[PDB]
Design a protein around this ligand. Structure first.
Ligand code: HEM
Ligand code: HEM
Ligand SMILES: CCOC(=O)N1CCC(Nc2cc(C)ccn2)CC1
Ligand SMILES: CCOC(=O)N1CCC(Nc2cc(C)ccn2)CC1
Ligand SMILES: C[C@H](O)[C@H](O)[C@H]1CNc2nc(N)[nH]c(=O)c2N1N=O
Ligand SMILES: C[C@H](O)[C@H](O)[C@H]1CNc2nc(N)[nH]c(=O)c2N1N=O
Lengths: 412, 412
């Protein structure tokens, strides 16, 4: 009937029924269950129609006051379109509803309380890489909003036969380059070494800097990817300063204000959109902990430790715990001072708890991935840590995809 | 053939084959798969014998230089014993091997690098509650070792028909009481309110203190549980002090030095031991973060915040991150100063990584529960966070049990 869920902090119990509408490798980053790969043929009609009907029923079923006639008419119209064209086009309202539901159904997102607040850019009529670039620049500009970050998503043309896929090769819209310097050292973001090289191979000019914004590698209509530099005026950045440590600024650190996922696929009513970049606003720890403190990234932990005069040669001293916190304080302080939207992990965590509570009352469940929802620092200090969660895949959904460079058949 | 596992920090890859020897509710605390319940009849022979043979093969297969004749003789002897008695007794060496393997197979234990270092107390001949108490006191004394903590396990009589089970009703050997005071406030450990009341119902005298060591509630031969106060001389405690904050001592905090799990069941070769308390040594965060900072426990976070002069009314200030770290420092500092064994979470985490590496080479796998292995603070700062893990149940294994008070048929 339902799955019992308990919060070991408040003792509160919840009943999950939503998992029934779903379609031990728990700590796996990219499991097949969260990946929707490529195709070389259109979706079989026997599979498409049922999914299409289901979504249309879900859409019309979401209205406060039902509109039965429109519901029947749409069901009929969709079927006919599938029979006559082999697929169908979602109405703008349906697409908007789908993008919000997919966000609402994202198990790895802690910011889901904001799910109903999403700007949707319909770029389904797009046809060239240049046009993609223009849509993306428009998105970046709208979302950035001079620091007052706004959530948005740009929907490109849906997959037809799988041979004409629109794809953004970048993992994120804004990301820094990584360079393997002559002296053997690594400059910039060590995690983008391979992708940076790819950009260089495609004609992009390497600037050998610590924070060089990578260009957009855009694939349109299944054709070879084209490189486009993002106009610097569109990239808002925050310079890192500490409210007490004047020497923090001497580290010369900065980060971009816009967190935008660029390579995921939107699945809805049998349709697949291989290109649908979206963004929200940053949670402090993403920058302060992952970007700055992961060893395979900027790895600034030890340097910050020394400057604080900490016993960096004795792990038991907990110097790492002290350093990471000052870096997190720097990130939040800098964004706030520069009037750029950002949320700390404690506030975000409480926000998600409220959302989860809302979801269980509204639809009897909330797909959630504990491993991703608990922040990279102060785990049990946040309420999410004490909350039992059920991880399942619904529809609409935002899936991962196989890296484009691994399945792309080059034309030259 | 094997399951591919990746460390997203070092990029290292590992192949898991051990999961084949195994017998999404990932964040569930007490799932049925980790619980081994009660019975009212002996284990069916058709089930027992196969498991017994398997274990005997595993035991003899662990020797560097094989002893084929002894192996065959033991296999024959065990079968005959099962046919003539309906069960069998493990040799002391087999039991020792089983306890270490079960520890080695504990997915939720970060201290497994120490798996081969375990003192085993054979109490299989025990028959009364008084005798249980004496064995437990002996265990506590040996393990405590005047601060130089030693890992040990006491094995009580195996389950026969399930009606004569030896059980320790306590979750841990040493634990503090919780009292619902007259003024409505809670004194002591809020998490032991119900169990404390049970002890009181059984005749134990409540001392209404903040740190009152709970008595042992012992069940022997399936009979009603008897209460036994632990002699204070056997309970080593550490008074909490901060290396810089003289006011920390004013909080009047302390904690016991001995971490001992008391209510789990040891499964091995078809046999079940409902009573087998074991202990290792503490990892700082257990006390500093869970015991002291969980809201449903001692909840000292805000008080420590104020005393540090922090902005405790502004979450974004990250005051909680600053407070929890000073508490962790206090715990480690206090244990070290009082010469009581303890390990910080960073060192423990690195220790487990080394162990995992050792296990994959030795037997092609290491069952691990990411959700429990990643410390309650500084998650991504530890290497375990970046390690993909596979969680599976092998044999021998340490299982949870249904709370005794829920299935016990009282004789009076
Ligand atoms: C409004 C503010 C938002 C906040 C603060 C927020 C925060 C986060 C954070 C912290 C993550 C983890 C990122 C990582 O560790 O890689 C995440 C993941 C995710 N978010 Fe949100 N989010 C927001 C908006 C959105 C929006 C607008 C969408 C979609 C329309 C969305 C979709 C997702 C998805 C699908 C993931 C998983 C990405 C992956 O698996 O790599 N989020 N979000
Ligand atoms: C030598 C030092 C040891 C250290 C530092 C260590 C540390 C830990 C820690 C931190 C936990 C988590 C406790 C919790 O969150 O509830 C744990 C769990 C566990 N440990 Fe170890 N351990 C050690 C020795 C042992 C020994 C000697 C055994 C068994 C013979 C063992 C068996 C287990 C088991 C089965 C669990 C899971 C308990 C549960 O699920 O509640 N550990 N250990
Ligand atoms: C390692 C580079 O990471 C990133 O560029 N990002 C981290 C991952 C991802 N974060 C996000 C995404 C969204 C949509 C909202 C808040 N936070 C996008 C930004
Ligand atoms: C909430 C009370 O918790 C406890 O008494 N403990 C916490 C849970 C458990 N910890 C342990 C156990 C072992 C065997 C080794 C290290 N640490 C036993 C002690
Ligand atoms: C191995 C493990 O799955 C991986 O390190 C995880 C852990 N948690 C997590 N949370 C978020 N929000 N983002 C992430 O990328 C990860 N993963 N790690 O990097
Ligand atoms: C809900 C979740 O499973 C629970 O809060 C967990 C999380 N992790 C964890 N690790 C250890 N080592 N011990 C634990 O008890 C827990 N759980 N929580 O208390």
């Amino acid at each position: 009937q339902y799955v019992r869920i308990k919060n070991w902090g408040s003792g509160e119990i919840l009943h999950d029924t939503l998992h029934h509408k779903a379609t031990c490798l728990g700590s796996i980053m990219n499991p097949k269950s969260l990946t929707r790969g490529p195709r070389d043929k259109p979706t079989p009609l026997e599979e498409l129609l049922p999914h299409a009907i289901e979504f249309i029923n879900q859409y019309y079923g979401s209205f406060k006051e039902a509109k039965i006639e429109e519901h029947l008419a749409r069901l009929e119209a969709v079927t006919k379109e599938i029979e006559t064209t082999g697929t169908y086009q979602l109405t703008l309202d349906e697409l908007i509803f789908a993008t919000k539901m997919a966000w609402r159904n994202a198990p790895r997102c802690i910011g889901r309380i904001q799910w109903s607040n999403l700007q949707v850019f319909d770029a389904r009529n797009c046809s060239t890489a240049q046009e993609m670039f223009q849509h993306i620049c428009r998105h970046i500009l709208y979302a950035t909003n001079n620091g007052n970050i706004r959530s948005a998503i740009t929907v490109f043309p849906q997959r037809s036969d799988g041979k004409h896929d629109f794809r953004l090769w970048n993992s994120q819209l804004i990301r820094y380059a990584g360079y393997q310097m002559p002296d053997g050292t690594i400059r910039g973001d060590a995690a983008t070494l391979e992708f940076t090289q790819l950009c260089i191979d495609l004609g992009w000019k390497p600037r050998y800097g610590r924070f060089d914004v990578l260009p957009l590698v855009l694939q349109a209509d299944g054709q070879d990817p084209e490189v486009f530099e993002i106009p610097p005026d569109l990239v808002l950045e925050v310079t890192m300063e500490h409210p007490k440590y004047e020497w923090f600024q001497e580290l010369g650190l900065k980060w971009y204000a816009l967190p935008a996922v660029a390579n995921m696929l939107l699945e809805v009513g049998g349709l697949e959109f291989p290109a649908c970049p979206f963004n929200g606003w940053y949670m402090g720890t993403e920058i302060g902990v992952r970007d700055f403190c992961d060893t395979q990234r900027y790895n600034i932990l030890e340097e910050v430790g020394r400057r604080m005069g900490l016993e960096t040669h004795t792990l038991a001293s907990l110097w790492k715990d002290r350093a990471v916190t000052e870096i997190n304080v720097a990130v939040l302080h800098s964004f706030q001072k520069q009037n750029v939207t950002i949320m700390d992990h404690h506030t975000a965590s409480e926000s998600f708890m409220k959302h989860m509570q809302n979801e269980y009352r509204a639809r009897g469940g909330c797909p959630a991935d504990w491993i991703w929802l608990v922040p990279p620092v102060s785990g049990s200090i946040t309420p999410v840590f004490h909350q039992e969660m059920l991880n399942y895949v619904l529809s609409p959904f935002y899936y991962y995809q196989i890296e484009p460079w691994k399945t792309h058949i080059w034309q030259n």
